[PDB]
Design a protein around this ligand. Structure first.
Ligand code: HEM
Ligand SMILES: OC(Cn1cncn1)(Cn1cncn1)c1ccc(F)cc1F
Length: 441
């Protein structure tokens, strides 16, 4: 079964690997085991004879990230999420409707769009803090409260008043919530591997669609994200259907909700920890210079340290652990060739723990730089680099800047939380994010 060019191979049984996943075993240790015993950063896990090739050598990142869809294809490997977004909507939109739709989305999230996003995000953060952090001091779940701030501020930024009246952020976040109710690794991993349907979350879509479809008529009967998606064309002259606009609105809120929530929480948890006083003080040296009301230029271009804070949070504990493609034509990676039919993967989690690229990788050090160019991949790279990355950072950084200007925070355990590997998109353990707020003097 070997070819003169293939990477080293580690056989596993499906049960044995199934067991590792179901039981939420640290996936970093398993991949680091493999990287060492096979003495290669590029290596294959043969599951049921089912080849998964990992680009775990940060010097080889571009070999994963740069090829076109026709060579390394995202479609086949994410097709299981189709019920999430709908049948002809993203990874399920046939060629070339997938790239066309992602690009429409991308175009709704450029820096020309962000106009008054910042004041809008500050007002929502301050409404929240005013409604929820009312006392001189009080106890909260930081993970839960960041997620609220993330949905509220996202919807305020992206949605018009008709939308926010019919579908409030609370509602939105429930509907989103009961979808990744069926995207746990323990349940998805095996049908993802076999090529089996997603094992409830199509009921939540049909609720949204009906709701949006009403909103959508109300408007055509009578410049936000919805309105921009509604104006989108396509190469062939036709526009997106209701079903496609709903699906891309979902893909959007879905993509950014859990990832940004988690990044904000890790950032705040590191910063508040007594051993990171130096950084919190550094953070203040930067943000104490600014007025009550921030602008785009303030947050995007005059907070380099806040940004390092966010970036290193995603570096140490990236929320998307692993990014995949189907190899459609064999591809050169390092001194190996990765054959047609392989699943090829590149893992932020694995590369962000490479000792050369990120020495002492468990130390959250905001002043760190990658020691191998392009080793950091928390938002991916190349053809499929994240296109909400700028909105994400504008959002998280404004929240950090707004929350730390008014409050101090005590973490109510001794150590920063354990990541919890039981969810698809990975964050700190919920019960471990209990925190005391203290209103500034
Ligand atoms: C902190 C927040 C975020 C993180 C950490 C993050 C992380 C990532 C990563 C690792 C990828 C690589 C995908 C791959 O190679 O398969 C990606 C892509 C992508 N992201 Fe994000 N992302 C974030 C926020 C968002 C937001 C807010 C949106 C939309 C509103 C978004 C939309 C997308 C899309 C459409 C792609 C891939 C497009 C394609 O397949 O060509 N992301 N993101
Ligand atoms: O890349 C994802 C899909 N994915 C990969 N593993 C689990 N889900 C996630 N993502 C990207 N940025 C933030 N989250 C994505 C790609 C496109 C999309 F529309 C949604 C979506 F979640």
């Amino acid at each position: 079964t070997t070819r003169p060019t293939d990477p080293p191979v580690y056989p596993v049984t499906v049960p044995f690997l199934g067991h590792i996943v179901q039981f939420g075993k640290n996936p970093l240790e398993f991949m680091q085991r493999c990287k060492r015993d096979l003495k290669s950063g590029v290596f294959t896990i043969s599951i049921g004879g089912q080849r998964v090739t990992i680009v775990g050598d940060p010097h080889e990142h571009s070999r994963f990230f740069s090829p076109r869809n026709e060579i390394l294809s995202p479609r086949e490997v994410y097709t299981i999420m189709t019920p999430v977004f709908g049948e002809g909507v993203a990874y399920a939109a046939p060629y070339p409707r997938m790239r066309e739709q992602l690009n429409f989305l991308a175009e709704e999230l450029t820096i020309a769009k962000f106009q008054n996003f910042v004041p809008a995000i500050q007002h929502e953060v301050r409404k929240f803090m005013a409604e929820n952090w009312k006392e001189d001091e009080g106890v909260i779940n930081l993970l839960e409260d960041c997620g609220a701030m993330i949905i509220n501020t996202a919807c305020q930024c992206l949605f018009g008043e008709d939308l926010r009246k019919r579908l409030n952020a609370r509602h939105f976040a429930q509907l989103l919530s009961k979808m990744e109710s069926s995207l746990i690794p323990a349940a998805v991993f095996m049908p993802w591997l076999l090529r089996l349907p997603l094992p409830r979350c199509r009921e939540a879509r049909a609720e949204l669609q009906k709701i949006l479809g009403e909103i959508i008529v109300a408007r055509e009967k009578e410049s936000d994200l919805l309105g921009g998606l509604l104006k989108a064309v396509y190469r062939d002259g036709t526009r997106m259907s209701l079903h496609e606009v709903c699906g891309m609105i979902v893909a959007a809120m879905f993509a950014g909700q859990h990832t940004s929530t988690i990044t904000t929480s890790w950032s705040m948890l590191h910063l508040m920890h007594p051993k990171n006083k130096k950084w919190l003080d550094k953070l203040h040296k930067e943000i104490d210079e600014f007025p009550a009301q921030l602008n785009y230029d303030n947050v995007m271009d005059e907070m380099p340290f806040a940004e390092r804070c966010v970036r290193e949070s995603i570096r140490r504990d990236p929320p998307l652990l692993m990014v995949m493609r189907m190899v459609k034509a064999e591809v050169k990676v390092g001194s190996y060739v990765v054959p047609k039919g392989d699943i090829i993967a590149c893992s932020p989690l694995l590369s962000h723990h490479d000792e050369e690229a990120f020495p002492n990788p468990r130390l959250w050090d905001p002043e760190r730089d990658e020691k191998v160019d392009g080793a950091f991949i928390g938002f991916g790279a190349g053809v499929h680099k994240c296109i909400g990355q700028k909105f994400a950072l504008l959002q998280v950084k404004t929240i950090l800047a707004t929350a730390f200007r008014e409050y101090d925070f005590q973490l109510l355990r001794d150590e920063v939380p354990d990541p919890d590997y039981h969810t698809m998109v990975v964050g700190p353990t919920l019960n471990q994010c209990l925190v005391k707020y203290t209103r500034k003097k």
